Each structure stands twice: as structure tokens, then as C-alpha cells.
Amino acid sequence: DFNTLAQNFTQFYYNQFDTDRSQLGNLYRNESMLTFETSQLQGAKDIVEKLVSLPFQKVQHRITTLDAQPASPYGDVLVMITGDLLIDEEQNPQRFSQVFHLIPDGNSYYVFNDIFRLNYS
Amino acid sequence: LDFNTLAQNFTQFYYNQFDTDRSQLGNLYRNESMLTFETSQLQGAKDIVEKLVSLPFQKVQHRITTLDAQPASPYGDVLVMITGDLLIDEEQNPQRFSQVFHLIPDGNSYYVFNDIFRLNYS
């Protein structure tokens, strides 16, 4: 159910991030907030700017866990993801944790909350 | 921060109770609250607490590595993501985890509406 909906949107999101992150703007809105580790941004413009500023040439997201729950009785969804992030030609991946608060929009969603952290052992 | 501080005030309270006696956490959940613990899905304070209590370990201590929060909507609720370690049975062998809480205001405190928990192998 919510896992399927979250699976579809989340996969679409990461596919776009790994393909061309400069085109992620349409998945965010003016009210959207991104906490990228220690960086705090608001709005599609600043959010995408931060993601594009990441100095890597290639990146691959590898999901290891995905869980979703309705965030309220009104259609919004909370999704938590953990996985591996392969940067450039690096052999050893970096662990990450991310949470999205998705708001219904048309036949899909837009991201209201985006919290991202790389996790170190 | 602001929300990080607000979220921290509550999360510390929550983990303090979890670490002393998790069977007493019911007051922090409600009928509609949902817990997803390693895919196991529970709803309501009774079932949620039963799950936490059923966890196979006597002593447990949470060590927080990162805590990040944001307002979940413009109206007062908070979203917080935590990454940390779980130390059980006084063992010096950390069990890493990631957790997300969707907190709803209640007086000067909050209750947990969404709780998602995952072990995160180190």
C-alpha cells in the first residue's frame, strides 16, 4: 500500500538524482525544506542548488531499507530510507539515512520535508 | 537549533524512559499511532508497547549520533530523524539504528504519531 506508493515515488526520485540532480526542482516547492547534513535550505531553488553543488561526477543510490506510513489521515506519507551511496569510482559505499514527508500532488507527490544524513561507523 | 532543540528535548525524554523501562512508554503514543519496527507493523499504544517490551534484551541504552528535525507542517508538528547506537546487556558492541518520529503537540510536550525504526548494520 503506502510502501508501494513510497517505493514508486522514491525510486523515481533517486533515479533522477543519479541521472541529473539539477532537474529535481519539480519535486520540491517554495515551502519545502532540505536538511542536508549540516546544510539547511528552503525552496526548490536553494534545495536544488545545494544538491548540484555536490562535487561528484557520478553517484548511485542503493536502497537497503524502505518503510512508509501515512503521516496523517489526509493523504500525506512519511518515508524512511537507508542505503548505500556509491560516489564516483569509489569501491566502498557510504551509508546514508533519509526521510521524506510527501504531500499528494496530482497523481504523485512533492517533497515537503527532506532530511538526509551520511552515517559513519 | 530551534526544532533540533525542541525535538531533542522530547527524544531525550523518550529514550530516557525507553532505557529505564520501555513498558511505561504507552503514555507517549495514541490509538492512531503507528510503529514500524524492522517491518513489523503495530498500531495503538497497547500493541506498540507490547512490541517494544517483547524485544529480547533486559538492559538497553541509546547513544545518539545525529539528530535532525524540521517542522512537519506549518501547524506545530515536528519530524525528527535520529541515527545512533543501541547498547544492550551492558555489552561493548554497539547495534546501530536509524529512527524517525512524527511528533504531535500535546500541552508543552508531544506524543508520537509515526515511529519508524530500523537496525542499520555498521
From Swiss-Prot, chain B:
Its main location: cytoplasm. Residues 6-119 form the NTF2 domain. It is found in: Cytoplasm. It holds the Pfam family NTF2. One of its GO terms (biological process) is protein import into nucleus. GO terms for molecular function: nuclear import signal receptor activity; small GTPase binding. Keywords: Acetylation, Cytoplasm, Isopeptide bond, Protein transport, Transport, Ubl conjugation. GO terms for cellular component: cytoplasm; nuclear envelope; nuclear pore central transport channel. Facilitates protein transport into the nucleus. Interacts with various nucleoporins and with Ran-GDP. Could be part of a multicomponent system of cytosolic factors that assemble at the pore complex during nuclear import. In vitro, the NTF2-Ran-GDP association, in the presence of GTP, triggers dissociation of the karyopherin alpha-beta complex, allowing nuclear translocation of karyopherin alpha and the NLS substrate. This is Nuclear transport factor 2. The lineage of its organism: Eukaryota, Fungi, Dikarya, Ascomycota, Saccharomycotina. The gene is NTF2.
